Amino acid sequence: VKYPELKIKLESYDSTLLDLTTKKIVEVVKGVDVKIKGPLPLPTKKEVITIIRSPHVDKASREQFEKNRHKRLMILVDVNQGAIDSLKRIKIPVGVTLRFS
């Protein structure tokens, strides 16, 4: 082993893409590695930005966009160093940004 508690945390601005990535990781880790509790939903940090529509005053009609940022979490009980060797080839997409322990 020599590396217990691989606490990988994945965060993205999309849900179905992050769900696909976590499904792929849970299926690939379902091989050599064991004792991996399932995906951990997180409160999906959210913000709203509001912008006036017209180039001129027209204040009474303004719209607003929203940059959603979904969040999940994984914990790995032990490395099983061959498992990280298999892990080296995952090539996750750019939309999901990783953060391990």
Partner RNA sequence: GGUACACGAAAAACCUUACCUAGACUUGACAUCCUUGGCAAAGUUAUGGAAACAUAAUGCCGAGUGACAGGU
Partner RNA sequence: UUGUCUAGCGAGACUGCUAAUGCAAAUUGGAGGAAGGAAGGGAUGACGUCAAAUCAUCAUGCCCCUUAUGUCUAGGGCUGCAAACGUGCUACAAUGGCCAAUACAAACAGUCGCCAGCUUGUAAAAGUGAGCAAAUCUGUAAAGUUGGUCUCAGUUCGGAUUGAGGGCUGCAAUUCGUCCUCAUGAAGUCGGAAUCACUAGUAAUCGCGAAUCAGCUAUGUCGCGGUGAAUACGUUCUCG
Residue numbers at the binding site for RNA (CB under 7 A): 9, 11, 15-16, 18-19, 41-48, 50, 52, 54-64, 70-71, 73, 99
**Contacts of residue 48, Cβ cutoff 8 Å, sequence gap at least 6:** 64, 65, 66
Decide if 97 contacts 11 (C-beta within 8 A): yes
Under rule CB under 8 A, residue 55 binds another protein: yes
Phi, psi of 28 (to 5 degrees): -70, -35
Under rule CB under 8 A, residue 97 binds another protein: yes
Give the interface with another protein as residue ranges (CB under 8 A). Answer: 13-14, 16, 46, 48-53, 55, 60-69, 93-95, 97
